[PDB]
């Protein structure tokens, strides 16, 4: 069959699927919302939003702004490469690792595309508790990465 000639490569269809859903997601909320506008789903807990993440969380590392676009893109590129080879070196029946890797790769490329094409990453998911605390807005790419990362972390049993 064809499953045997491409090895572990067809797991990248999960990566593509993640990438696409991530980009359709962002495109929608770029179209439907203005910056920081929020569509309330659960008044106290959860809302859609629109935010551009130029990465101000790591602003403490430099007297310049705008470098996160390139540094983080660079890290994405580097980590993506190493993640692909490590997907290839896998065996059939290691289905847990393949999925986890594909998820992280999809999220990595999703935000990588943003930092390169746009100047920033698009964020639309706003989870919070009333006006007591707000969780930093994220997207599907982050979710794929986070779920992917946790799956890897629970692999060390």
């Amino acid at each position: 069959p064809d499953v045997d000639r491409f090895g572990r490569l067809p797991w990248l269809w999960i990566t593509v699927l993640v990438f696409v859903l991530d980009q359709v997601s962002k495109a929608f909320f770029q179209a439907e919302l203005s910056m920081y506008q929020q569509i309330v789903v659960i008044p106290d807990l959860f809302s859609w939003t629109l935010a551009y993440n130029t990465g101000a969380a790591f602003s403490f590392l430099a007297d310049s702004s705008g470098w996160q676009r390139w540094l983080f893109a660079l890290i994405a590129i580097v980590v993506s490469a190493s993640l692909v080879v490590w997907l290839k070196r896998l065996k059939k029946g290691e289905t847990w690792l393949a999925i986890a890797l594909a998820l992280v790769l999809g999220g990595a490329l999703g935000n990588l595309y943003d930092r390169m094409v746009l100047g920033h990453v698009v964020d639309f998911i706003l989870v919070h508790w009333q006006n007591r605390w707000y969780f930093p807005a994220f997207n599907l790419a982050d979710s794929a990465i986070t779920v992917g990362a946790v799956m890897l972390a629970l692999d060390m049993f």
Partner: peptide, 4 residues
């Protein structure tokens, strides 16, 4: 990799 993530947004932030």
């Amino acid at each position: 990799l993530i947004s932030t």
